[PDB]
């Protein structure tokens, strides 16, 4: 398998500004061990897409920094999204 | 044998911010030579959970900077915890 550590969330296209608003995000991943859970609350780290410094400053919701002990496999996931008062999924695989 | 060089205490689930009021930690353990005995009264040292800098901060009972001379084996521990003025054993193996 091949496991996932981290999300580049919305690479930047012509027309989008929305990740100002939208500031926290929280992950209800399946983990290794007891895998529907609340991982827990974190906020973007926009540095780059694909790994590239000659690339605009796209949102990545870091999967590494979360309240886990195991790591996170291909199963399942659910991305839920805080702005101010929504909770809004803006993404589910 | 595989011996002990520390604790990862409490590593943070969804609703736990205990190790804030709890400040202190004396070990009981069973050395290599005259055993259980007063380890020593201690603190924690916060620095992650597995080694890892992407996760957050959780508690570390530090079983080395102890008054001891040999090495702690995987016999028995008892863990005595101490706030302001309770003595209460958080945890036991």
């Given at each position: 398998?091949?496991?996932i550590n981290g999300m580049y969330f919305a690479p930047t296209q012509t027309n989008k500004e929305?990740?100002?608003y939208i500031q926290k995000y929280r992950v209800e991943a399946t983990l290794q061990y007891s895998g529907f859970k609340d991982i827990g609350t974190k906020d973007k780290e926009m540095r780059?897409?694909?790994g590239d410094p000659n690339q605009p400053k796209t949102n990545y919701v870091n999967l590494r920094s979360y309240?886990?002990?195991g790591?996170?496999?291909m199963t399942y996931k659910k991305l839920r999204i805080y702005?101010?008062?929504p909770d809004d999924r803006e993404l589910l695989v």
């Open positions: 398998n091949t496991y929305a990740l100002d780059n897409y694909l309240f886990t002990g790591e996170n496999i702005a101010i008062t």
